[PDB]
Amino acid sequence: GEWEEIDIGPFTQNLGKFAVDEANKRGQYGRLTFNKVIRPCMKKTIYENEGFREIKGYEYQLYVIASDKLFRADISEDYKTRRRKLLRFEGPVPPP
């Protein structure tokens, strides 16, 4: 379950949009307008069992610019359902 860098193409942009959507709902970072996810985007695989290949889900770490501010978002994604949760959202953060 090590971190792996992934691209910042549409899938990743949409992860950033999910994070900003969720941050907007939480109301702790004001009203944010998603702009883009920038590199690096990191993904880790969560396994169902230590020592087994069955994937439980993923965690992503994204740097997302919203309303001209850079945030770092952590998102979980369930393997089976693809259900996502914003785990953490902080910023503005230093440029990565």
Curated annotation (Swiss-Prot):
It holds the Pfam family Monellin. The keyword Kinase does not apply. InterPro entries: Cystatin_sf, Monellin, Monellin_B, Sweet-Taste_Mod_sf. SUPFAM superfamilies: Cystatin/monellin. Natural monellin has not been mass marketed to the food industry, primarily due to the challenge of large-scale purification of the protein which is relatively sensitive to heat or acid treatment. Keywords: Taste-modifying protein. The record marks C41 as: Blocking, abolishes the sweet taste. Heterodimer of an A chain and a B chain. Taste-modifying protein; intensely sweet-tasting protein. This is Monellin chain B.
